[model samples]
Target chain A: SMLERTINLYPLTNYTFGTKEPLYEKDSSVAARFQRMREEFDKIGMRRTVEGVLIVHEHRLPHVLLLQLGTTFFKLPGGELNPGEDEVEGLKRLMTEILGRQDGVLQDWVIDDCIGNWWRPNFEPPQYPYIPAHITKPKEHKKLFLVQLQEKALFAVPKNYKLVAAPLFELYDNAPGYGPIISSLPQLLSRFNFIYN
Target chain B: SMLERTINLYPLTNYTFGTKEPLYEKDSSVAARFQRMREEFDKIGMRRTVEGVLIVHEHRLPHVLLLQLGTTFFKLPGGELNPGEDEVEGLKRLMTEILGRQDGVLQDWVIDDCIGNWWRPNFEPPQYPYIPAHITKPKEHKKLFLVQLQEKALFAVPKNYKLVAAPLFELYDNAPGYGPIISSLPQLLSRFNFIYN
Candidate 1:
């Protein structure tokens, strides 16, 4: 039966990470980030964003690669896409900019399946799996894609951020710690037939 | 200071299930089911269906309540909504019909959050997380809502089916066993802050 068609995930040890030059954000602070969002809304319309959910297995459970900032904040490796940019292509670009190896060889990111979609009713913290009926114009739309990892690869982590592999149990039902989008990943990823190598 | 909001889930043993009279299906067979679907599609336009994700906990992991038929097929406790029926109200009606206690006290099913939505492009096997742009007309739209269970409750399972509490691990990535919508539930349910009591 075609071997059941599973996505092969390797152990965490199979992947290697090294430090790279600090990558600065487009905005200096949260205030500036939202400020830029408001300014860009008029020019570009609703922001189209993509985030990658990279998985690795350890101790018989799946772990997600996350970028941690400061003491508590953590996010997936992706960002806003340019207007008219393809979703998969934009995700590859953002992943490479954030976690791609600094060496000359380009990272081969295999992105195909979309895990989930969230919509922000307004320019705010709250985002839902489905857009609320009352909101006529949503401020942003974020799509989460499952970025399939190679059997082994090297990733360069920006100096300002620490890359962490969080087990599914840690991420499960952890909306307070990881926010709605990141926390919901464990459920979104459950549909894939995964083969742990 | 207000405490952080969390959804409390009780152990599986806290809830009790008893067998009730056999609840017959609307269609006699799979072929008949689809045949009826086509006939109804012409009558009611695109079908809007809602399914409830009822949860309990065991071994420190959340378990989903599913109805099992024969040895292989399993489904959530919900079915098709009548024309113009409200989603939540329809889901409650379906749940009561499927598993509500026979003693006559109405089950208090607290349903608010929508976990995920799936769209059937052509009334076929495949359902995608997001509607594909190429397909303008989807045949059926399925919405999953998280149905919060009270601390203790009684359920009367139909004699023809068995109500099973499937742990998260069992459903995680078992698409072949549970199909796309049910298998992806671990990710859909991951966003909540679940407190095991």
Candidate 2:
């Protein structure tokens, strides 16, 4: 068996879109309440968070985008890569968290150059120096997750994700979802940096 | 630069107990929270809810089971994974969502694999004839987020991620943060499948 694992270099997987139909949405059945969030914050007390963009690989399209959350005050979801943990481990953690469940198939890596980190103040008001810590420190980071879906069409966005963006249309043929910023589509993907921000 | 762009098949990182830490009282801020038993189910419509263990990779001894959350959850605290995006890209999106406000560093290929599947209330919980759409589905994934301090000390949990399980000391070290279950730490370090859950 190659006794193999995978690597995830794309750090962040997020967006600034608000939409209805999504690939991975919310599942109220899952017990991740706000009180629970606070409780968890208090429990871990220490956490590992990083910056990066969420890139969607369209089958026919040449690339993806460098986007952000149109909405703030939301807890972006991901896993804390352990020291010495391999790439596949990191990737699996990311998928489970976002999917809110487990799967048999996994994803593959995309980019590695730069952890896709764009400017900050993710909302309508884009701001300066980004998040001061990032500008000052560069060494402290989690691997960026550059992955593609195994079944490109089996996409689902939990309703609770409160999507504020467009749907990933490249593979989603019959998907009854909206598209993203028509203007930023090209540049959104052109950047070669692995989404670190 | 190796241009380490492709997914490398590595071994999963297994974990175990090296030394021991008094879990009755953890140095982490979140420790106090997990200790309690909640009556009401956590009520937060966040994004993804993840469940994993916490471990302390000590210098002198082995590792410690800092804590273990029965069920974990991660929402679009800042936002959810970008819609219509690749899995790895979505993880990258989350990195920025949670840690954009801070500085974070990540290690490469060290991450192992990514796995996920949807649970849509199977009449009998499915699992019988599970056939994935993509035969070449990535065995690896983007999950692990190996995070460390910029200077190597003062660890702070960003507001984005919240722990679900309380930190606890198990019989082993390298306890919590590892994946899939095995006997010892040596197995984790030497095997790749150990890293995958």
Candidate 3:
């Protein structure tokens, strides 16, 4: 009776946390990697990167394309925007580069929506795998967008990279496999599902 | 027939863009106001302002509270974070301050997922409702989080400020009513509806 009455009195069907788990660990080699990327972007005075979430279909069944960069590193198909280059155009170009095609692979894909931003302060260190005593000032920002392809299409993989199409349900199977892409899958899928359904 | 068939074949549902319509005109006094806010925040040597999107209910009907600074400018109830304060806590504090009550009024609110961040680069001026060309670089990053209050609660208004509970359907009735909050409502509500349903 208590549980039923409580549920009826305050039905909290949806609850969301405003804070986020830290994106990088203080001592992790991962944090070092991102810090290094910041320097590369800072050289040119650009401080933002764009990521793409490609939801494709193979055999008419929906799946997401996961990219592998060597043995352990994995990422969504996206990269930095050139200084002064438009965000959408940059994303398009990155997708083209990833697929190894340019004629118009993106023409059939709909720019679904941006799931969320992977934000870091210019100088505030992210507290994640562990909090740190001092964080290097941030020099760049990263954003991820959800792009839905009309149907399954073949995409070429660059020589140094590997690509695999996995069903939505299998995203968590490789929790830390694709790193940011894998971690952001739930939010990305939430937006994707909200729109399509 | 051709158009209908094409529409049916490729139902374009969710499309999102990163760029946004400018909240204030370049030449208007409003731009001067934003420039002023920038100056106030920039004094600390930072460049981004994070915002909170509060979804409150009154009269058992869903409504969004919009703040009016003067005759024309409008905004959601949010402000800057206290030096390194967590984003969620900063939002809750602002909400409490604005409501003119110290009681735990917002304990019931659930922070729904953020729809997207209204990101703009530092020193790069917004193009719409054009502002002066020499506006200074921003020091506070602007972030918008969709916060859904679990139960209806009354809020207080500070002097020189007015609050309006706009029904969801009437969001666009006045395009510039609440500035960015009004502009971002459709997407925020879209995410809110999907999750709650």
Candidate 4:
């Protein structure tokens, strides 16, 4: 994997974290601190919804790339986050909406490589550099959660729903777009043609 | 697997593309356009990012999940957007700067499920929301690519050349405190746990 080789190039897993006392706060008001506590984000102009993940196959099981169940629309099978859905809840919501049937367990896993982005807004900026609303930039912060499937998820397809469209991609080489999926991914990673090993 | 279910849930793959074209340069002037764009981003202050994946072990051997990567570092990896630094070049640039080394070939993948943002720059009645200069919203038109690894590229260090950091998380997720990795991610997705599937 891309991140694997980079590990050898740098001291990845061993960075010296800060020694400052950590600040705890209720989720309700964390947003207010953007001006002070985490002002760096102010430089990036953002206000909500952040996430990213660096997917790699399990070391022992290289052939089986790791996977997970989340609230986002990632698992296109059906369940997607509603306008105001919570992250954790979105995961469960997707399952119920897609499954047709219900009753399944969910779990969280570790993360390796991660990336982030500012949400693309519908507006533009001023001539002089100006901070958007509470955000310093118009970007979303993506979180990469290294996780695994709880178990053999019974991903049965119902007749009402059919896999009609082929898979869609967002980032392409020398092509038309970009995003947060590639920061930690080293080059040389193949596209599409999977490995059986 | 989750997506497999979604494919099964929806009877067909429907596309919601813009069929009509808006008025040409209804609002002209590059400066104004830029200003408006920035302001629009600020008004709709709910930015978001998500990471997850799809893993298949039973019927199919491989799986896919959700992940993203982004940042306007401006500089290319190893060099500028010169030769060899085409599309993957940016990916390579980001990977090398952050992750440290190159791994599996990075294939472009696009995510279909996306939303848009805007900046209004505090416009009067606001013709459109404006995204402050520094911010950007995740666009629905983005095409996220896929970069499958040849070998298992695992977690590693970044080349600390002032160029790399752990993963560009939403700063403050960990203790002590990391530099402003990026701006505010929506409160829901700013998780301490990094996940990659």
Candidate 5:
């Protein structure tokens, strides 16, 4: 029954977000990010990244918690894992770092289920759900995990980023808008039996 | 561990397909199909349908068993269920009717996991992963199940249909080619841990 398990989703009102100190990126610029990626690729081979998909409910449907950067760019609440770090543990750390309470309250992030895996064949933009046959060496591997939320919780959103709740329908086929990985979330999440509380 | 369960996918060569008697559609034409759909909607309300996603392995990737009707049109092996019919039983019966052996040997289809659900808001073409808020009454609800294949088996495909195995990449973000539901399968299936044999 694990595959057919039910996930209880609380209404958006149950979750509250407050502004925290702005969390800066590891690399200052996009150029620096890819440059570090290239240097790290030499050291770590393929970069292993993990992301968390947090769910809340509104309008009788599931909504994903997303951190918006500017007007159009949005991302999930996770980042790159440390070398040789456990995936689940690393995700919990990243989640806490990004959205944990600023009041020193320890956050409990339950990351039991992995929702999907995507692979970047090259250092470039394209990433696929499965590794392409022609490419033997992939540049990066990203694992997406479902972060279960409790009945009520408080999150400290970074001052620079705006945390928003986006419905499944908005991300369904809007690859152009949310990009391939985020857009596909609607299908990735469709299997769950969600109980709106 | 069911959520983290491994699904063993055999190589494409492990399975073979033979020709069976031509299985005709209940409705003669598209117009007739829609006509019957409208007529059934009055009696049954929302039409309940099921489709099976049969997976095979090839080139170190998972391929879906799809029935190609023409140069471009392709569909999964399934159909609408009878009123009051069980979803799993109806899917098995439809699978057998489409690809069952002609030699009278029963095909064992282990259909346990449902991959996704789609709803048709209107009697027209658009179907979404979740129901749109504005539309209260959905014309149809289609559930897709993951059909686990044995290590190897012989499939007698209908003579009128050409069975082809499509890679997940072919279907990913290919809404124009495979439609919204089928195209999103790559995302729907990404959660599974597949063991290629």
Candidate 6:
């Protein structure tokens, strides 16, 4: 089947996540930080994180739905993948959850394009096994994806974050108040542009 | 297992192309025109073609290797996909052949992002199949992938089409004498600049 062949590279597994709780749900601080430091202490180690750029073209302009937290951070709607979860599927789930749509299920919104990979902080390994894990370069890579929505999300943002649509300018502008998504906006947007433009 | 799983979406078969000849190996006229009017006459009738964007950055600059055909038209290195060929795999194959290396095979060159789906003649799908393929938006839908190379390709570009690297600016400057690739350059490069900067 075309669907199977398209997804073969991801190696999907029947292994479901152990819990429905978000990886950082226990700590608002961790969710606020939104870095991968916790994975460093777990049974496994650090891995690449895939982010979905849910781009909504409203009134003929490209508006990105960002999760505005406190007065400092603006996050794209996405999160870490579960073990063996399909990259595309996991992203759909994250987007659905972030958009706060359930009723029963959903459809239509799809991964439009692969936006490219970017690196945040450089990685360094711990001196020993007992210490938290570490890695670098490609391993620390962040995958960005382009997605389109047929209907505007009702803005059921999560507890700590409120969804806001910002014009592309405010994103790559790197303004003082905008936070980290602004910092990496250019590299991420670079690939997004190349794919969609 | 992983390969099969990963490639499950694009169903492959034992089928080989009826002829070994490249799509354009014999068409001097079509190669010059770079259009698919002839493909419309096939027993199967008109079919839309998907071409990959083989973007290569060399010399610390965004270098697009254009296939110099006749006096004016420059083509990005790509061709139509075979039946059930994975979009990504088919592109890597086209790019590899263009690179002209056959020894140990390759890596490092990866799909950084999807530039976007563009229409060639701009979409004008006909009201009826026999009426001719009329479509809305763009004439030809082009699926572009932003590709990166760790090392510059050393291929001896084949006869008829010499490979030339044009910087992004010159490509999109709307310079006279050049054709399609130049005309589409601005829209494409616009996204690229946002992402990179």
Judged by whole-model lDDT over C-alpha atoms, candidate 2 comes out at: 0.29
Candidate DockQ scores, in order: 0.06, 0.02, 0.02, 0.02, 0.59, 0.05
Q: Tens digits of per-residue lDDT for model 5 on B1-197?
A: 23465788999999989998887778877788788889999988999989999999876689999998756578998999998898999999999988999898988899878788888897777788788888888999988999999999999988888999999889877878988788877877887889988
Q: B60-175, model 2: which lDDT tens digit per residue?
A: 12232222222342221112233245444444444433333234433121222222222111112122001223323222111222221121222223432332221112221232
Docking class of 1: incorrect
Number of the top-ranking candidate, with TM-score as the measure: 5
Error of 4 at A161 (Å): 5.0
lDDT of 6 by residue, A66-156 (tens): 7676555677777777666777777777876765433534545567455444443433321110111132322344456666554323434
| TM-score, cand. 2 vs. native | 0.25
Candidate 4 C-alpha lDDT tens digits along A7-72: 111121221111222222223343563333245344434434423222222221112121122221
Order of models, best lDDT first? 5, 1, 3, 6, 2, 4
**By lDDT, who's the top model here?**
5
Model 2 lDDT per residue over A1-197, tens place: 11123322221133222233344322332244334434544555322333223344323223333223344223233445545555555555555445432243333423343222222222122322112232432222333333442223222334445422232233221212212122222222222222222
Scored against the true structure, residue B155 in model 5 reaches a CA lDDT of 96
List, residue by residue over B1-197, the lDDT tens digit for candidate 1.
11112578999999889988988788888789888888999988888888888889875577889999756689888889888798888999999999887788888889766666677788566676545445778888877777889999999999889999987657755778998677667556544567889
Candidate 3 chain A TM is 0.61
Residues B47-146 of candidate 3 have per-residue lDDT tens digits of 4444556544433334556777556566677776766577666776776666533344344444534443333334343421111134355334555666
Worst 10 residues of 4 chain A by lDDT: A3-12
The value of fnat for model 1 is 0.08
In angstroms, the error of model 4 at B34 is 43
Chain A accuracy as TM-score for every candidate? 0.94, 0.36, 0.61, 0.31, 0.95, 0.61
CAPRI grade, predicted model 4 = incorrect
**What's candidate 6's DockQ score?**
0.05
The runs of at least 3 residues in candidate 3 whose Cα sits more than 4 Å from the true structure, single-residue gaps closed, are A1-38, A57-62, A102-109, A122-137, A173-175, A193-197, B1-197
Which RMSD values do the candidates have, in order? 17.2, 23.7, 22.0, 23.2, 1.8, 13.8
Model 3 Cα displacement at B150 (Å)?
A: 16
Error of 2 at B46 (Å): 48
CA displacement after TM-score superposition, residue A172 of candidate 5 (Å) = 2.5
